[PDB]
From a paper:
The F-BAR domain of PSTPIP1 binds to the PEST subfamily of protein tyrosine phosphatases (PTPs): PTPN12, also known as PTP-PEST, PTPN18, and the lymphoid phosphatase (LYP), encoded by the gene PTPN22.
We determined the previously unknown structure of the isolated F-BAR domain of PSTPIP1. To better understand the molecular basis of the physiological function of PSTPIP1 in the immune system, and its role in autoinflammatory diseases, we elucidated the 3D structure of the F-BAR domain (residues 1–289) using X-ray crystallography. Initially, we solved the structure of the G258A mutant, and subsequently that of the wild type protein. The two structures were almost identical. After superimposition, the root mean square deviation (rmsd) between all the equivalent Cα atoms was 0.275 Ǻ, which was similar to the estimated errors of the coordinates of the structures (0.23–0.24 Ǻ). The asymmetric unit of the crystal contains two molecules of PSTPIP1 that form the characteristic elongated crescent-shape of F-BAR dimers. The concave side of the F-BAR dimer is overall electropositive and contains two clusters of basic residues in each protomer, one in the core region, and the other near the tip of the wing. Large acidic surfaces are observed in the F-BAR domains of other proteins, such as Cdc15, growth arrest-specific 7 (GAS7), and formin-binding protein 17 (FBP17), but are absent in several F-BAR domains. The residues of PSTPIP1 critical for binding to PEST phosphatases (see above) are located in this electronegative area, supporting the notion that the acidic convex area is important for PSTPIP1 function.
Residue numbers in the entry:
A (entry chain B): 4 to 289
B (entry chain A): 5 to 289
Write the structure that this text describes.
């Protein structure tokens, strides 16, 4: 039980603080989406540099002087290092795609937000404009009523024993002043009528904008929460990929027998199984 | 299946068996260096990677967010630094393994040089006395040929030659036979001196082979173990990071979209009633 429409009004007729607070929340939401975008961007750059560095270490690493099992195990470690480095380079492209998804979502909400801003700014400007005119008409109407009352009181004063020419002067003046009070009343009634029509338009627009702004925040909170859940899974998935790649190094080490490598080197590089015969004395005549 | 019984040479002057084994130790030393450089470069990569993760976490924003989504974002920032700090610790772990192999490699070089000096000394003496024995054989056989030419010259003229000439050639043949006998003793002694050194070389060669085989058994064991430990430490880093990333998902489970919307409304609400319309006010009422 909480809605933007029912909870962002203002008793002050000339105040639009409710709309301003909601519009500020959207601006704060836009900044939050940018901060999520920048974190993915920098993280992708960290993954790319890290992935490329792992690949370079694997390619340029040595081990050519080793043979048999230990050579295969070392070549297996180099091979899996390149696989991890390439996988982290692939992760950088994945994060940059998530960055592009939020990037176009942020601009899509800005386009729809600007449309509501133009409507509200127009109707609020007109509401305050006609309210100012109605108060100016109200002041004139109340001044004309005072003029009409004082003009009639002046006529009744001199109508008692005043001269006929003087009495007729105040009577025609009071009639002219009383008509001006009627005309000022019609203009004041018209100003109130014009203000009422715009006020009902503003209240309908404000309720419409509140429902729309709440939908924009519900969508933004949902997609940002989803972005964090997907980002955490993609990073956790990278740990599982790497652990499986490092498992291939351990699988190669399982077939690494120290005694087998020693026997393999002996059989391949053996020179002789018999020591040289001693040099004996040779008689020249026998 | 032993180094001693399988690295001899029928050629008396050949020590190829020892040279092949020493070449294998040099190839093993280079392999240990290559394992050292792989750990060094990997440690440098982990440190650079870890430090960058920390910097991204510290400098990341999100200050405009509130309630659950802010806490979830702060959880990712906090765990990113935890992962980055853990990778810096991994670099120090790999550098200690690098230092462990480095001191094993230098301890084997010191012991190898000691066996190299012993074998080089006895092999140099073995070839030296063999050369002297062959030089003595050449002189002994040359003195025998001189004795043969001295006896044939006497026997040629001993038939009908003059008494003075026959007695002259007889004394020459007697002196040539004496030189062959004296040269024979020098040749016999050279063979005797060479034989004692040869038996010493055979005992040294067998001892050095067992030592070189023990050095290879130690090197293969520590290098195979180093690969096994290195793979486990990298796999341990994947498990640590997954546990740190698990804290981000645990924070997201308590992230309710409706709760954050309600929290903003309760905190920033301005009014529940729209403003009353402006009515016509009669000056006389």
């Amino acid at each position: 039980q909480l809605q933007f429409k029912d909870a962002f009004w203002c008793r002050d007729f000339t105040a639009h603080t409710g709309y301003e607070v909601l519009l500020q929340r959207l601006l704060d939401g836009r900044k939050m989406c940018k901060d999520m975008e920048e974190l993915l961007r920098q993280r992708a750059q960290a993954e790319e540099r890290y992935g490329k560095e792992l690949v370079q270490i694997a390619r340029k690493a040595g081990g050519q002087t080793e043979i048999n099992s230990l050579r295969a195990s070392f070549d297996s470690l180099k091979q899996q290092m390149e696989n991890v480095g390439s996988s982290h380079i692939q992760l950088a492209l994945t994060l940059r795609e998530e960055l592009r998804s939020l990037e176009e979502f942020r601009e899509r909400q800005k386009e729809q937000r600007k449309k509501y801003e133009a409507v509200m700014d127009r109707v609020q400007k007109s509401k305050l404009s006609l309210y100012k005119k109605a108060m100016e008409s109200k002041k004139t109407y109340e001044q004309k009523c005072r003029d009409a009352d004082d003009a009639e009181q002046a006529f009744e004063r001199i109508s008692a024993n005043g001269h006929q020419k003087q009495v007729e002067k105040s009577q025609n003046k009071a009639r002219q002043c009383k008509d001006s009070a009627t005309e000022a009343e019609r203009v004041y009634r018209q100003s109130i009528a014009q203000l009422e029509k715009v006020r009902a338009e503003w209240e309908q627009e404000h309720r419409t904008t509140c429902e729309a702004f709440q939908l924009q925040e519900f969508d933004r909170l949902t997609i940002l929460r989803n972005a964090l859940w997907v980002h955490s899974n993609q990073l956790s998935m990278q740990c599982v990929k790497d652990d499986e790649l490092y498992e291939e190094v351990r699988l190669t080490l399982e077939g690494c027998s120290i005694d087998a490598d020693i026997d393999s080197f002996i059989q391949a590089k053996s020179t002789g199984t018999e020591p040289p015969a001693p040099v004996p004395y040779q008689n020249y005549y026998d």
